[PDB]
């Protein structure tokens, strides 16, 4: 495993995040003040059968050396659950692959959320047509990360410092 961290998005550079929604649900994103420097504010309106998310399609899909993913989050509002999702790459050259999720509820102060990869759960409400149906998160085959709906409610939150986390230090190995 790698030691240290690897920044995926500190929100100080290119705008990496695309928005999608349907069935009456909506999301919009913008750059705002973050935890350090700038961050991305996500404003969403849920609906009963609708969906929304914001997505970063990653240029490097091999996360096998790392242990956790971390980000800072804060609500801007009534507390409301969302999901952070990792999608594998598709088995058929189009769309995405297997969806893996973890639920988070932004609150009124900045919090760093570190999620071990082994804590992600296989998404139960939906899988895309190009999923591998492996029931294991394949860290050498990552397509994208998302902040997306959990429910039919509305809210506003800000994220910053999306990064991979490895081992804490290089330590001496026993023989
Ligand atoms: C979206 O596509 C992204 C693409 O725009 C971008 O170019 O590349 C990235 C990275 O590869 C893509 O992520 O991908 C998301 C995640 O797979 C799609 O979201 C799913 O959309 C389906 C509908 O197409 C939706 O299913 C509906 O869910 C509702 C609510 O539960 C249900 O009532 C409906 O019956 C379902 O059809 C899933 O919930 C979403 O995750 C998005 O559509 C793409 O644009
Ligand atoms: Ca920042
Ligand atoms: Ca898989």
Q: Which residues pair with 5 in a beta bridge?
A: 165
Tokens, residue 65: 């050396």
Q: Are 20 and 55 in contact (CB under 8 A)?
A: yes
**What resolution, expressed in A, was reported for this entry?**
1.5
CA of 133 to the centre of ligand 1 (A): 17
Distant-in-sequence, close-in-space partners of 28: CB < 8 Å, separation ≥ 6? 19, 42, 43, 44
β 154-165/142-149 pair status? unpaired
User: Which atom of ligand 1 approaches the CA of 85 most closely?
Assistant: 16
Nearest CA to ligand 1 atom 44: 20
* CATH fold of the domain at 1-168: Jelly Rolls (2.60.120)
Scanning 37-83, the segments in alpha helix (DSSP H) are none
What experiment produced this structure? Answer: X-ray
- Interatomic CA distance for residues 164 and 69, integer angstroms: 5
CA of 13 to the centre of ligand 2 (A): 9
CA of 37 to the centre of ligand 2 (A): 4
Q: Are 144 and 87 in contact (CB under 8 A)?
A: yes
Region of 140 (left: φ > 0; alpha: ψ -120 to 50; beta: rest) is alpha
Burial 18-49 (b: 16+ CB within 10 A, else e): eeebeeebebebeeeebbeebbbbbbbbbbee
DSSP 133-174: --SS--TTSEEEEEEEESSS-EEEEEEEEEEEE-BSS--PPP
Rounded to the nearest 5 degrees, what angle is found at the Cα of 73, between the Cα atoms of 99 and 157? 90
CA of 103 to the centre of ligand 1 (A): 17
Domain range list for the chain: 1-168
| Candidate of 45, 55, 127, 151 to mutate for ligand 1, largest count of ligand atoms within 8 Å of Cβ | 55
- Interatomic CA distance for residues 155 and 70, integer angstroms: 21
Ligand 1 neighbourhood includes 54 CB (under 6 angstroms): no
């Amino acid at each position: 495993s790698a030691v240290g961290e690897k920044m995926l998005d500190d929100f100080e550079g290119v705008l990496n995040w695309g928005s999608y929604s349907g069935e009456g649900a909506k999301v919009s994103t913008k750059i705002v003040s973050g935890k350090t420097g700038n961050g991305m504010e996500v404003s969403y309106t849920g609906t009963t059968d609708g969906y929304w998310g914001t997505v970063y399609s990653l240029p490097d899909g091999d996360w096998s050396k790392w242990l956790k993913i971390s980000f800072d989050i804060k609500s801007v509002g009534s507390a409301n659950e969302i999901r952070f999702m990792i999608a594998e790459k598709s088995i058929n050259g189009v769309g995405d692959g297997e969806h893996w999720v973890y639920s988070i509820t932004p609150d009124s102060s900045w919090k760093t959320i570190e999620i071990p990869f082994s804590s992600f759960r296989r998404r139960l409400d939906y899988q895309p047509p190009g999923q591998d149906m492996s029931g294991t998160l394949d860290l050498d085959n990552i397509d994208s990360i998302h902040f997306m709906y959990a429910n039919n409610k509305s809210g506003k939150f800000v994220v910053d410092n999306i990064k991979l986390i490895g081992a804490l230090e290089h330590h001496h190995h026993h023989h």
